[PDB]
PDB file of C-alpha atoms and ligand atoms in Angstrom:
ATOM      1  CA  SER A   1     -10.672   7.577 -15.911  1.00  0.00           C
ATOM      2  CA  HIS A   2     -12.248  10.630 -14.044  1.00  0.00           C
ATOM      3  CA  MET A   3     -12.397   8.367 -11.132  1.00  0.00           C
ATOM      4  CA  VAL A   4      -8.915   7.962 -10.633  1.00  0.00           C
ATOM      5  CA  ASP A   5      -8.272  11.703 -10.927  1.00  0.00           C
ATOM      6  CA  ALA A   6      -9.395  11.858  -7.253  1.00  0.00           C
ATOM      7  CA  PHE A   7      -6.315   9.989  -5.768  1.00  0.00           C
ATOM      8  CA  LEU A   8      -4.047  12.186  -7.923  1.00  0.00           C
ATOM      9  CA  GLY A   9      -1.638  14.528  -5.488  1.00  0.00           C
ATOM     10  CA  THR A  10       0.806  13.701  -2.387  1.00  0.00           C
ATOM     11  CA  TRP A  11      -0.584  12.075   0.667  1.00  0.00           C
ATOM     12  CA  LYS A  12       0.829  12.084   4.252  1.00  0.00           C
ATOM     13  CA  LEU A  13       0.232   9.671   6.740  1.00  0.00           C
ATOM     14  CA  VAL A  14      -1.918  10.603   9.976  1.00  0.00           C
ATOM     15  CA  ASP A  15      -3.279   7.625  11.457  1.00  0.00           C
ATOM     16  CA  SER A  16      -3.036   3.784  11.389  1.00  0.00           C
ATOM     17  CA  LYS A  17      -4.510   0.274  13.180  1.00  0.00           C
ATOM     18  CA  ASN A  18      -3.050  -2.564  12.554  1.00  0.00           C
ATOM     19  CA  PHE A  19      -0.184  -2.188  10.395  1.00  0.00           C
ATOM     20  CA  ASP A  20       2.120  -4.284  13.159  1.00  0.00           C
ATOM     21  CA  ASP A  21      -0.018  -6.958  12.902  1.00  0.00           C
ATOM     22  CA  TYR A  22      -0.099  -6.521   9.028  1.00  0.00           C
ATOM     23  CA  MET A  23       3.522  -6.954   8.218  1.00  0.00           C
ATOM     24  CA  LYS A  24       3.635  -9.774  11.367  1.00  0.00           C
ATOM     25  CA  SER A  25       0.945 -11.538   9.174  1.00  0.00           C
ATOM     26  CA  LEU A  26       2.959 -11.159   5.934  1.00  0.00           C
ATOM     27  CA  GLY A  27       6.315 -12.321   7.981  1.00  0.00           C
ATOM     28  CA  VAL A  28       7.910  -9.233   8.865  1.00  0.00           C
ATOM     29  CA  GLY A  29       9.835  -9.739  11.816  1.00  0.00           C
ATOM     30  CA  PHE A  30       9.727  -7.327  14.726  1.00  0.00           C
ATOM     31  CA  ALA A  31      12.891  -5.488  14.486  1.00  0.00           C
ATOM     32  CA  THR A  32      11.659  -4.283  10.812  1.00  0.00           C
ATOM     33  CA  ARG A  33       8.473  -3.843  12.105  1.00  0.00           C
ATOM     34  CA  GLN A  34       9.380  -1.644  14.916  1.00  0.00           C
ATOM     35  CA  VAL A  35      11.290   0.688  12.135  1.00  0.00           C
ATOM     36  CA  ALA A  36       8.246   0.551   9.473  1.00  0.00           C
ATOM     37  CA  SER A  37       5.888   1.411  11.884  1.00  0.00           C
ATOM     38  CA  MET A  38       7.677   4.353  13.327  1.00  0.00           C
ATOM     39  CA  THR A  39       7.532   6.178  10.097  1.00  0.00           C
ATOM     40  CA  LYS A  40       5.322   8.444   8.474  1.00  0.00           C
ATOM     41  CA  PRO A  41       5.560   7.784   4.889  1.00  0.00           C
ATOM     42  CA  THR A  42       4.415  10.084   2.002  1.00  0.00           C
ATOM     43  CA  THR A  43       2.584   8.583  -0.899  1.00  0.00           C
ATOM     44  CA  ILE A  44       2.822  10.093  -4.291  1.00  0.00           C
ATOM     45  CA  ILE A  45       0.263   9.468  -6.755  1.00  0.00           C
ATOM     46  CA  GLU A  46       0.893  10.749 -10.192  1.00  0.00           C
ATOM     47  CA  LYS A  47      -0.834   9.725 -13.983  1.00  0.00           C
ATOM     48  CA  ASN A  48       0.927   9.776 -17.259  1.00  0.00           C
ATOM     49  CA  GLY A  49      -1.929   9.591 -19.744  1.00  0.00           C
ATOM     50  CA  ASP A  50      -2.443   5.988 -19.418  1.00  0.00           C
ATOM     51  CA  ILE A  51       0.053   5.179 -16.769  1.00  0.00           C
ATOM     52  CA  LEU A  52      -0.307   5.387 -12.973  1.00  0.00           C
ATOM     53  CA  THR A  53       2.448   5.591 -10.919  1.00  0.00           C
ATOM     54  CA  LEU A  54       2.630   5.393  -7.200  1.00  0.00           C
ATOM     55  CA  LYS A  55       5.746   6.394  -5.322  1.00  0.00           C
ATOM     56  CA  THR A  56       6.046   6.226  -1.456  1.00  0.00           C
ATOM     57  CA  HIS A  57       8.523   8.277  -0.101  1.00  0.00           C
ATOM     58  CA  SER A  58      10.091   7.609   3.940  1.00  0.00           C
ATOM     59  CA  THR A  59      13.076   6.984   6.055  1.00  0.00           C
ATOM     60  CA  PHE A  60      12.365   2.914   6.364  1.00  0.00           C
ATOM     61  CA  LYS A  61      11.962   2.708   2.659  1.00  0.00           C
ATOM     62  CA  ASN A  62      11.073   4.579  -0.660  1.00  0.00           C
ATOM     63  CA  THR A  63       9.541   2.364  -3.587  1.00  0.00           C
ATOM     64  CA  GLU A  64       8.160   3.333  -6.939  1.00  0.00           C
ATOM     65  CA  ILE A  65       5.811   1.700  -9.190  1.00  0.00           C
ATOM     66  CA  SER A  66       4.126   2.165 -12.506  1.00  0.00           C
ATOM     67  CA  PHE A  67       1.373   0.457 -14.206  1.00  0.00           C
ATOM     68  CA  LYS A  68      -1.744   0.120 -16.223  1.00  0.00           C
ATOM     69  CA  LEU A  69      -5.009  -0.395 -14.963  1.00  0.00           C
ATOM     70  CA  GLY A  70      -5.904  -3.987 -15.765  1.00  0.00           C
ATOM     71  CA  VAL A  71      -2.360  -5.265 -16.716  1.00  0.00           C
ATOM     72  CA  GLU A  72      -0.411  -7.662 -14.880  1.00  0.00           C
ATOM     73  CA  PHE A  73       2.961  -6.174 -13.772  1.00  0.00           C
ATOM     74  CA  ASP A  74       5.817  -7.567 -11.354  1.00  0.00           C
ATOM     75  CA  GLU A  75       6.796  -6.023  -8.526  1.00  0.00           C
ATOM     76  CA  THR A  76       9.428  -5.731  -5.662  1.00  0.00           C
ATOM     77  CA  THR A  77       7.264  -4.909  -2.595  1.00  0.00           C
ATOM     78  CA  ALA A  78       9.160  -2.650   0.597  1.00  0.00           C
ATOM     79  CA  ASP A  79       9.411  -5.881   2.528  1.00  0.00           C
ATOM     80  CA  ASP A  80      10.683  -7.771  -0.498  1.00  0.00           C
ATOM     81  CA  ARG A  81       8.276  -9.841  -1.756  1.00  0.00           C
ATOM     82  CA  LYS A  82       8.773 -10.558  -5.495  1.00  0.00           C
ATOM     83  CA  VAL A  83       4.886 -10.481  -6.276  1.00  0.00           C
ATOM     84  CA  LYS A  84       2.605 -10.579  -9.380  1.00  0.00           C
ATOM     85  CA  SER A  85       0.177  -7.218  -9.049  1.00  0.00           C
ATOM     86  CA  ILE A  86      -2.551  -6.140 -10.635  1.00  0.00           C
ATOM     87  CA  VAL A  87      -4.443  -2.891 -10.143  1.00  0.00           C
ATOM     88  CA  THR A  88      -7.879  -2.585 -11.019  1.00  0.00           C
ATOM     89  CA  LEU A  89     -10.839   0.061 -10.121  1.00  0.00           C
ATOM     90  CA  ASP A  90     -14.405  -0.507  -8.702  1.00  0.00           C
ATOM     91  CA  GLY A  91     -16.180   2.037  -8.588  1.00  0.00           C
ATOM     92  CA  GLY A  92     -14.174   4.481  -6.250  1.00  0.00           C
ATOM     93  CA  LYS A  93     -12.018   1.967  -5.280  1.00  0.00           C
ATOM     94  CA  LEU A  94      -8.589   1.098  -6.676  1.00  0.00           C
ATOM     95  CA  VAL A  95      -7.745  -2.335  -5.888  1.00  0.00           C
ATOM     96  CA  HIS A  96      -4.560  -3.600  -5.793  1.00  0.00           C
ATOM     97  CA  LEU A  97      -4.053  -7.199  -5.790  1.00  0.00           C
ATOM     98  CA  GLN A  98      -0.574  -8.992  -5.037  1.00  0.00           C
ATOM     99  CA  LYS A  99       0.092 -12.824  -5.390  1.00  0.00           C
ATOM    100  CA  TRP A 100       3.065 -14.544  -4.980  1.00  0.00           C
ATOM    101  CA  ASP A 101       4.237 -17.883  -3.505  1.00  0.00           C
ATOM    102  CA  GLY A 102       0.144 -19.176  -3.285  1.00  0.00           C
ATOM    103  CA  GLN A 103      -0.415 -16.390  -1.399  1.00  0.00           C
ATOM    104  CA  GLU A 104      -2.445 -13.324  -1.703  1.00  0.00           C
ATOM    105  CA  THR A 105      -2.733  -9.405  -0.456  1.00  0.00           C
ATOM    106  CA  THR A 106      -5.276  -6.913  -1.477  1.00  0.00           C
ATOM    107  CA  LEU A 107      -4.415  -3.088  -1.297  1.00  0.00           C
ATOM    108  CA  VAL A 108      -7.575  -0.900  -1.488  1.00  0.00           C
ATOM    109  CA  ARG A 109      -7.560   2.771  -1.512  1.00  0.00           C
ATOM    110  CA  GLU A 110     -10.618   5.036  -1.470  1.00  0.00           C
ATOM    111  CA  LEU A 111     -11.616   8.539  -0.925  1.00  0.00           C
ATOM    112  CA  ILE A 112     -13.682   9.376   2.027  1.00  0.00           C
ATOM    113  CA  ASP A 113     -14.297  13.022   3.628  1.00  0.00           C
ATOM    114  CA  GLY A 114     -11.016  14.514   1.172  1.00  0.00           C
ATOM    115  CA  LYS A 115      -9.021  11.580   2.925  1.00  0.00           C
ATOM    116  CA  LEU A 116      -7.113   8.471   1.203  1.00  0.00           C
ATOM    117  CA  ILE A 117      -8.083   5.410   3.035  1.00  0.00           C
ATOM    118  CA  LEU A 118      -5.708   2.406   2.448  1.00  0.00           C
ATOM    119  CA  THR A 119      -6.950  -0.881   3.862  1.00  0.00           C
ATOM    120  CA  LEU A 120      -4.430  -3.734   3.693  1.00  0.00           C
ATOM    121  CA  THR A 121      -5.740  -7.369   4.028  1.00  0.00           C
ATOM    122  CA  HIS A 122      -4.176 -10.744   4.443  1.00  0.00           C
ATOM    123  CA  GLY A 123      -5.970 -13.243   6.080  1.00  0.00           C
ATOM    124  CA  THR A 124      -7.645 -12.362   9.688  1.00  0.00           C
ATOM    125  CA  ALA A 125      -5.138  -9.181   9.069  1.00  0.00           C
ATOM    126  CA  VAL A 126      -7.014  -6.073   8.228  1.00  0.00           C
ATOM    127  CA  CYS A 127      -5.105  -2.495   8.549  1.00  0.00           C
ATOM    128  CA  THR A 128      -6.416   0.626   7.747  1.00  0.00           C
ATOM    129  CA  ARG A 129      -4.120   3.669   6.941  1.00  0.00           C
ATOM    130  CA  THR A 130      -5.247   7.421   6.877  1.00  0.00           C
ATOM    131  CA  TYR A 131      -3.947   9.828   4.844  1.00  0.00           C
ATOM    132  CA  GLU A 132      -4.108  13.257   4.614  1.00  0.00           C
ATOM    133  CA  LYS A 133      -3.644  15.590   1.396  1.00  0.00           C
ATOM    134  CA  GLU A 134      -1.024  17.606   1.199  1.00  0.00           C
ATOM    135  CA  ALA A 135      -1.569  20.041  -1.895  1.00  0.00           C
TER     136      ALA A 135
HETATM  137  C1  5M8 B   1       2.519 -13.247  17.061  1.00  0.00           C
HETATM  138  C2  5M8 B   1       3.303 -14.362  17.598  1.00  0.00           C
HETATM  139  N1  5M8 B   1       4.301 -13.963  18.634  1.00  0.00           N
HETATM  140  C3  5M8 B   1       4.815 -14.712  19.612  1.00  0.00           C
HETATM  141  C4  5M8 B   1       5.759 -14.766  20.371  1.00  0.00           C
HETATM  142  C5  5M8 B   1       6.194 -15.859  21.155  1.00  0.00           C
HETATM  143  C6  5M8 B   1       5.891 -17.234  21.150  1.00  0.00           C
HETATM  144 CL1  5M8 B   1       6.696 -18.350  21.719  1.00  0.00          CL
HETATM  145  C7  5M8 B   1       5.175 -17.630  19.944  1.00  0.00           C
HETATM  146  C8  5M8 B   1       4.022 -16.739  19.272  1.00  0.00           C
HETATM  147  C9  5M8 B   1       3.041 -16.583  17.960  1.00  0.00           C
HETATM  148  C10 5M8 B   1       2.745 -17.910  18.039  1.00  0.00           C
HETATM  149  C11 5M8 B   1       3.010 -18.454  16.689  1.00  0.00           C
HETATM  150  C12 5M8 B   1       2.211 -20.162  16.520  1.00  0.00           C
HETATM  151  C13 5M8 B   1       1.754 -20.682  17.664  1.00  0.00           C
HETATM  152  C14 5M8 B   1       1.996 -19.853  18.979  1.00  0.00           C
HETATM  153  C15 5M8 B   1       2.329 -18.768  19.156  1.00  0.00           C
HETATM  154  C16 5M8 B   1       2.748 -15.466  17.404  1.00  0.00           C
HETATM  155  C17 5M8 B   1       1.652 -15.471  16.204  1.00  0.00           C
HETATM  156  O1  5M8 B   1       1.953 -15.090  15.432  1.00  0.00           O
HETATM  157  O2  5M8 B   1       0.620 -16.166  16.548  1.00  0.00           O
HETATM  158  C1  5M8 B   2      10.518 -11.947  18.138  1.00  0.00           C
HETATM  159  C2  5M8 B   2       9.501 -13.036  17.592  1.00  0.00           C
HETATM  160  N1  5M8 B   2       9.757 -14.198  18.575  1.00  0.00           N
HETATM  161  C3  5M8 B   2       8.840 -15.062  18.182  1.00  0.00           C
HETATM  162  C4  5M8 B   2       8.630 -16.240  19.178  1.00  0.00           C
HETATM  163  C5  5M8 B   2       8.232 -17.799  18.850  1.00  0.00           C
HETATM  164  C6  5M8 B   2       7.454 -17.465  17.344  1.00  0.00           C
HETATM  165 CL1  5M8 B   2       6.579 -18.803  17.124  1.00  0.00          CL
HETATM  166  C7  5M8 B   2       7.140 -16.366  16.537  1.00  0.00           C
HETATM  167  C8  5M8 B   2       7.864 -15.196  16.617  1.00  0.00           C
HETATM  168  C9  5M8 B   2       8.001 -13.604  16.071  1.00  0.00           C
HETATM  169  C10 5M8 B   2       7.129 -13.677  14.789  1.00  0.00           C
HETATM  170  C11 5M8 B   2       7.987 -13.759  13.715  1.00  0.00           C
HETATM  171  C12 5M8 B   2       7.217 -13.203  12.333  1.00  0.00           C
HETATM  172  C13 5M8 B   2       6.090 -13.180  12.866  1.00  0.00           C
HETATM  173  C14 5M8 B   2       4.980 -13.519  13.594  1.00  0.00           C
HETATM  174  C15 5M8 B   2       5.618 -13.694  14.931  1.00  0.00           C
HETATM  175  C16 5M8 B   2       9.092 -12.877  16.448  1.00  0.00           C
HETATM  176  C17 5M8 B   2       8.625 -11.254  16.184  1.00  0.00           C
HETATM  177  O1  5M8 B   2       9.884 -11.444  14.969  1.00  0.00           O
HETATM  178  O2  5M8 B   2       7.890 -10.551  16.201  1.00  0.00           O
HETATM  179  C1  5M8 B   3       1.747   0.063   0.712  1.00  0.00           C
HETATM  180  C2  5M8 B   3       2.824  -0.744   1.869  1.00  0.00           C
HETATM  181  N1  5M8 B   3       2.959  -2.107   1.899  1.00  0.00           N
HETATM  182  C3  5M8 B   3       3.908  -2.199   2.550  1.00  0.00           C
HETATM  183  C4  5M8 B   3       4.205  -3.785   2.622  1.00  0.00           C
HETATM  184  C5  5M8 B   3       4.941  -4.171   3.736  1.00  0.00           C
HETATM  185  C6  5M8 B   3       6.363  -3.212   4.203  1.00  0.00           C
HETATM  186 CL1  5M8 B   3       6.952  -3.922   5.262  1.00  0.00          CL
HETATM  187  C7  5M8 B   3       5.810  -1.956   3.958  1.00  0.00           C
HETATM  188  C8  5M8 B   3       4.925  -1.302   3.493  1.00  0.00           C
HETATM  189  C9  5M8 B   3       4.409  -0.077   2.903  1.00  0.00           C
HETATM  190  C10 5M8 B   3       5.771   0.786   3.778  1.00  0.00           C
HETATM  191  C11 5M8 B   3       5.044   1.214   4.636  1.00  0.00           C
HETATM  192  C12 5M8 B   3       5.855   2.409   5.020  1.00  0.00           C
HETATM  193  C13 5M8 B   3       7.304   2.784   4.943  1.00  0.00           C
HETATM  194  C14 5M8 B   3       7.421   2.330   3.708  1.00  0.00           C
HETATM  195  C15 5M8 B   3       6.830   1.142   2.823  1.00  0.00           C
HETATM  196  C16 5M8 B   3       3.678   0.553   2.362  1.00  0.00           C
HETATM  197  C17 5M8 B   3       3.521   1.853   1.878  1.00  0.00           C
HETATM  198  O1  5M8 B   3       2.459   2.554   2.741  1.00  0.00           O
HETATM  199  O2  5M8 B   3       3.943   2.004   0.829  1.00  0.00           O
END
């Protein structure tokens, strides 16, 4: 859509809250958390007609997903969960839902003041990750 166009580009992490707690909630062990916490990853968001691609680049792990809005797709996460995923658009918010093993976690991205804010939720664990556009 025209709402999606605003997310397009290269984004760099400049701040983080509760990410270690989030990973813990998912079951990521201390050793891996220490490593993933330390990194300051870059996320590339691109569009190719109907297909959105989302790339994360970092020393900890590189991941890439492509998908169409509203169409369920399989995903292997950075922490190696095999999940059923679906990305929707609620107004300004790009809402990513992952299901697996009777569990659910949401990854919401919205634009606020030219910054991309990613909110990762799993149960009581709520993580806020702030990105600045590189352009
Ligand atoms: C994050 C953490 N770190 C710990 C380190 C050491 C020990 Cl012994 C326990 C914990 C626990 C914990 C888990 C179940 C019952 C009670 C505590 C937790 C927790 O996630 O709740
Ligand atoms: C190092 C350690 N020691 C523990 C001792 C006891 C219990 Cl119950 C839990 C832990 C945990 C833990 C593992 C996953 C999620 C949450 C906590 C850890 C940790 O890997 O971070
Ligand atoms: C969205 C997401 N979900 C995750 C869930 C669990 C773990 Cl362990 C890592 C991630 C990561 C990630 C964080 C740092 C470097 C690389 C990837 C990301 C990501 O920002 O791309």
